From a paper:
Bgl1 catalyses the final step of in the decomposition of cellulose, an unbranched glucose polymer that has attracted the attention of researchers in recent years as it is the most abundant renewable source of reduced carbon in the biosphere. Bgl1 is a member of glycosyl hydrolase family 1 (GH1 superfamily, EC 3.2.1.21) and the results showed that the 3D structure of Bgl1 follows the overall architecture of the GH1 family, with a classical (β/α)8 TIM-barrel fold. Bgl1 has a half-life of 250 h at 60°C and it has been shown to be a thermostable enzyme with a broad substrate specificity and saccharification ability that efficiently hydrolyses cellooligosaccharides to glucose. The catalytic site residues of the enzyme are two glutamic acid residues, Glu163 and Glu361, as in other enzymes that belong to the same family.
The crystal structures of Bgl1 from the thermophilic bacterium C. saccharo­lyticus and its complex with glucose were determined at 1.47 and 1.95 Å resolution, respectively. In the case of the Bgl1 complex, the overall structure is the same as that of Bgl1. Superposition of the molecules in the asymmetric unit of the Bgl1 complex structure onto the Bgl1 structure showed that the r.m.s.d. on Cα atoms (453 residues) is 0.32 Å and that on secondary-structure elements (905 residues) is 0.36 Å. Comparison of these two structures showed that the residues lining the catalytic site of the enzyme have the same conformation, except for the side chain of Glu163, the χ3 torsion angle of which rotates by ∼30°, and a negligible change of Asn219, the χ1 torsion angle of which rotates by ∼15° to optimize the interaction with glucose. The crystal structure of the enzyme also includes a chlorine ion in the same position as in the Bgl1 structure and a total of two molecules of 1PE (also present as PEG in Bgl1) and one molecule of PEG (bound very close to the position previously occupied by glycerol in Bgl1), as indicated by the 2Fobs − Fcalc and Fobs − Fcalc electron-density maps. The rest of the differences observed in the vicinity of the active site may be attributed to the glycerol molecule entrapped between the two symmetry-related molecules in Bgl1 that induces changes to the side chain of His324, the torsion angles (χ1 and χ2) of which rotate by ∼78° and 34.1°, respectively, in the presence of GOL504. This change is additionally associated with a change in the side chain of Trp322, which is also subjected to a rotation of the χ2 torsion angle by 131.4°. Calculation of 2Fobs − Fcalc and Fobs − Fcalc electron-density maps showed that at the catalytic site of the enzyme, a glycerol molecule was bound to Bgl1 and interacted with the catalytic residues Glu163 and Glu361, but when lactose was used as substrate analogue, β-d-glucose, the product of the catalytic reaction taking place in the crystal, was bound at the same site.
Author numbering:
A (entry chain A): -4 to 453
B (entry chain B): 1 to 453
The structure:
C-alpha cells in the first residue's frame, strides 16, 4: 500500500550561497582593509584574464535589489560570508563601524523579508595585515579570528542563528599554502599542514565559547567532500591491496582530514602516519596535532557540505603527486569546470556520513554547476543543463532523506554569477546571470525552475 | 546531400592492437613487444601478446565484416612478420598470413586498405637508432616496396604512416609510447625521417607507374580559443601562441605532405627556444622541398578538438593551457564535438590543394557492459557515430572531397598505454574466451551503410 513519499522535512532550508570576495566589490570603500585576495588579484599572473574582485557583482551597493530577488525566488535561507576586513581593517584593533553598518542593513533586510541569514565567518579573505605576520601559519591568528568571530556572533545572534566557522579548510590550507593557486599563494606542504591545524583549533574555540556562554546559536563548519571511486572496480577487475590502500589514503586527505577532527576529535591516523613516513610531515608535529585536537575537540551543531563531483582514481607508481595515484575521467556529462556530473556521488556521500559518523544535522551549503551561459535576443538564459544538474542533485538529496539521512537544508551555489577565484569571471554558477558591463541581473531559466521546486517542496 | 556512389564505408584496426601471436611463425620482436614487456609502461601490465588473436581468428572477423556490409577494411601490416630483423631474410609465414587475409577480404567483396606502418618498428632497427637513424628510410622503403609489389593487384590504397605526430612525439619526446625515448630534438629528427620515408614510397610508385594510390594518415585536432568561447577580445600574443601549438599538432605534417615545406614560424620558434638546432631547421626545409611529392589521398584520424588559452606560467613548450568545455566526454576524457570534424574538413578544403580525403579513424571509447542477455547497449557510441556521420555528410554537402569513412574500431583491442581498459569496438571482445559479441552500434552502422550506399 502506498504510504506518503518521504519529502523534504517541514522547515527545510532551501537557500542560495555567496561569498564576500566573490560578489561584494567595494574593495577599498568605507574603511575596508586589504584582504589577501585584494593582494592576490592585484598581482600579475594569478587570475585568468587578469580579473579581480574590485567590483565583482557590486553587491555592497546593490544588496537591496539582490534581497528583493531572493524574496521573489522564495528562498527560506541565504548563506553569505562576512568580510573580516570590513570589520577589522587590520585584523584586530579598532572596529570599523561602517562595516558593521553594512552587515546590519543586509541582515535586517533579510529578516524583514522572512529569509533566514546563515553566515560564513571565514570564506578565504584573511586581512592582508595578518598575512604579513604569517597568516594562518602564525598560532596567534587563532586568537584574532576568535575575537572577530565572537564580536559578530554577539552582534547578530538575535537574527543569525546558524554560523559556519570556515568554508572548505581543505582549500584554505592546500590551495592557499601548498599549491599556491589561491591567496596567499604560498607553496609549502608543511606550512599547509600547520594551517590545517590552526583552522581546526580556531573552529573548536568558537564552538566551545558559544556553548560555554550558552549563546543561543548553532555553530558548524563547511567541508568540501569528493567521494572517491576506483577505476579498477569500474573495469570489473580485482583490486590489489596496494591500490586499495593508496587510493584510500588519497581519499582520506580529501575527505577525512577535517571530517574526523570535526566529528570525532582526531585526525585520520593512517594518513598522518603515511605523511610522516614520506617525510612530508614531522613526526613531532603529527603527534602534537593529534594531542591538541583531542584536547580541544567539541562536537558542532551541524555539518555543512559543499558537493560538486566525484573523483575516479587508480594506482600509478610513476605519479608525481604525494600519493602514487592518477585520475580517470569516466564518460558522461561535464561542466565548464571539467567536473563530472554525478548526482549519485551526493547520495553515496550522505549515506556514508550517516553510517560512519555520529548523527548530526547536515546542510548542503553549496551545490551547483558552471555552464557557458548565453543571453538570448529576448533577454533570457535557457540554461537547461543547469536545470538538469540541479534537478538530479535535489533528487539525490531527497533519496538520502528517504534513507534516513538527517538533511536539513540545501544551498545552491550560486544565487548569482560571480568571481570564481583564480578562474575570474570565466565560470558562471549563478541561477541569476550578471552582465558585468551593466550589473544587470537576469533571471536564468534555472531561477524559475528553483522557484517552482521550492514552492512544491516546502 | 547523399554520400557519393562508391563511398568507402569502412572499419579500421592495427596489427599490434588485434593480432596477438607476438612470437609465432618466426615473427621478430617489435618496439611494442619490448615496450609492453617492461614494467610501469602500460595500465594494469597489459600487453599485446594475445590481444584479439586475430592472427588465428581472421576468418571469423572477415565474416563479421561481410555481415556488417563494409565496403572497405583498413588494417596494418606488421613489418616484423615480414622482415623479423627489419631487413635481410624475408619470412614466408608472415607473407602467407597477409596473403590469406587479403584473399579472404577480396573474395568477400571488401576493399583492403593497408597501413604500412602503424607504430610497430622492428626492435632490431631500434637497436641501431630506429627512426633517428637516416638508414631507416631505406629499410622502410624496401619493406614497403616489397609488400606493395606483392599485393598491388588486390590492394589499391596504401597508407605510408599512421599518425607520424604520435610516432615522433609520443614515442621519442613524451616516451609514453614505444620506444619510450624522451628527447625533443630526436623527435624532430624522427618527424623528418618519416616525411622522407613517405615521399620515397610515393615517388617510387609514381615513377614505376604502379597502379595503386599512396597516402598518409595524420591525426588532426582542430583548436579553438577559450577567449572566443567567452566572447572576449583576443590578444595578439595569445593568438600567436595558441596558433603555434596548433601548428605542432596539425600543420607540422600537413604542410610537408601537401605543400612541400614545414611551417616556418613553428621551426623559427623551436630554434628560438633551443628546441631545434638552427642547422637542422634549414636542412629540413631544403630536404622536404627537394623530395616533395603530392600524394593520391589524405587520411585523417579525428576524435576531438582542443580548447586552449594563453598561460605564461605554463611548463609546456608553448605558454598555453587547455580548457574543458561543458558537454559529453568519452572514457578517454575526450570531448564529443562533431562540429570539429566539419570545421576541420572545410579548413582542409579551403587551405590546401584539392585532394581526396578519407576519414581513416573516428570512434569513441565507452565502458561497455555485456548484459545478462549477451548484448551491449552502447547507445552513446551510436549517438557519437551518428553525429560524426552527419558532420561528414555536411562536409560533402559543402564541397569537401570526402571519399570514405573508417570507424575505429571493428573490435575492442589493445589501446596502447591504456591497455585493454578502453573499448572502441562496434564488436565487443571477451578477452578470456575471445568471443566476439556484436554491439548495438554494429547494427546501427550496418543499417547506416545500407541506407547510404
Ligand atoms: O568552485 C565553485 C565554488 O565552490 C565552493 O566550494 C566554494 O566555497 C566557492 O567559493 C566556489 O565558488
Ligand atoms: O586512440 C584510439 C586510436 O586512435 C588512432 O589515432 C590510432 O591510430 C589507433 O591506434 C588508436 O587506438
Ligand atoms: Cl547571549
Amino acid at each position: 500500500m502506498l504510504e506518503d513519499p518521504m519529502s523534504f522535512p517541514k522547515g527545510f532550508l532551501w537557500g542560495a550561497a555567496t561569498a564576500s570576495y566573490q560578489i561584494e566589490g567595494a574593495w577599498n570603500e568605507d574603511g575596508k582593509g586589504e584582504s589577501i585576495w585584494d593582494r592576490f588579484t592585484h598581482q600579475k599572473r594569478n587570475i585568468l584574464y587578469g580579473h579581480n574582485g574590485d567590483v565583482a557583482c557590486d553587491h555592497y551597493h546593490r544588496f537591496e535589489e539582490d534581497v528583493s530577488l531572493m524574496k521573489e525566488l522564495g528562498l527560506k535561507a541565504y548563506r553569505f560570508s562576512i568580510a573580516w576586513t570590513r570589520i577589522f581593517p587590520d585584523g584586530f584593533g579598532t572596529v570599523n563601524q561602517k562595516g558593521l553598518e553594512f552587515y546590519d542593513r543586509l541582515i535586517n533586510k533579510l529578516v524583514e523579508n522572512g529569509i533566514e541569514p546563515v553566515v560564513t565567518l571565514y570564506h578565504w579573505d584573511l586581512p592582508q595585515k595578518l598575512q604579513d605576520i604569517g597568516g594562518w601559519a602564525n598560532p596567534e591568528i587563532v586568537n584574532y579570528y576568535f575575537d572577530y568571530a565572537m564580536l559578530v556572533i554577539n552582534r547578530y545572534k538575535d537574527k543569525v542563528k546558524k554560523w559556519i566557522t570556515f568554508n572548505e579548510p581543505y582549500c584554505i590550507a592546500f590551495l592557499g599554502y601548498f599549491h599556491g593557486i589561491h591567496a596567499p599563494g604560498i607553496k609549502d606542504f608543511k606550512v599547509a599542514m600547520d594551517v590545517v591545524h590552526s583552522l581546526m583549533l580556531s573552529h573548536f574555540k568558537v564552538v566551545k565559547a558559544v556553548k560555554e556562554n550558552n549563546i543561543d546559536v548553532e555553530v558548524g563548519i563547511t567541508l568540501n567532500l569528493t567521494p572517491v571511486y576506483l577505476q579498477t572496480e569500474r573495469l570489473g577487475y580485482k583490486v590489489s591491496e596496494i591500490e586499495r590502500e593508496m587510493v584510500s589514503l588519497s581519499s582520506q586527505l580529501d575527505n577525512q582530514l577535517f571530517l574526523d577532527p570535526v566529528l570525532k576529535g582526531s585526525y585520520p591516523q593512517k594518513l598522518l602516519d603515511y605523511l610522516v613516513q614520506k617525510d612530508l610531515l614531522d613526526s613531532q608535529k603529527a603527534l602534537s596535532m593529534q594531542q591538541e585536537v583531542k584536547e580541544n575537540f567539541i562536537f558542532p551543531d551541524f555539518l555543512g557540505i559543499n558537493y560538486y563531483t566525484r573523483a575516479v582514481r587508480l594506482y600509478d607508481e610513476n605519479s608525481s603527486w604525494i600519493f602514487p595515484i592518477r585520475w580517470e575521467h569516466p564518460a558522461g556529462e561535464y561542466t565548464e569546470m571539467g567536473w563530472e556530473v554525478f548526482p549519485q556521488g551526493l547520495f553515496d556521500l550522505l549515506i556514508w556520513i550517516k553510517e560512519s559518523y555520529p548523527q548530526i544535522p547536515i546542510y548542503i551549503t553549496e551545490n551547483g554547476a558552471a555552464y557557458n551561459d548565453i543571453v538570448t535576443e529576448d533577454g533570457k538564459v535557457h540554461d537547461s543543463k543547469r536545470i538538469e544538474y540541479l534537478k538530479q542533485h535535489f533528487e539525490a538529496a531527497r533519496k538520502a532523506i528517504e534513507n534516513g539521512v538527517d538533511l536539513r537544508g540545501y544551498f545552491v551555489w550560486s544565487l548569482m554569477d560571480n568571481f570564481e577565484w583564480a578562474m575570474g569571471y570565466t565560470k558562471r554558477f549563478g541561477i541569476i546571470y550578471v552582465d558585468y558591463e551593466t550589473q544587470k541581473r537576469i533571471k536564468k531559466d534555472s531561477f524559475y525552475f528553483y522557484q517552482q521546486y521550492i514552492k512544491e517542496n516546502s
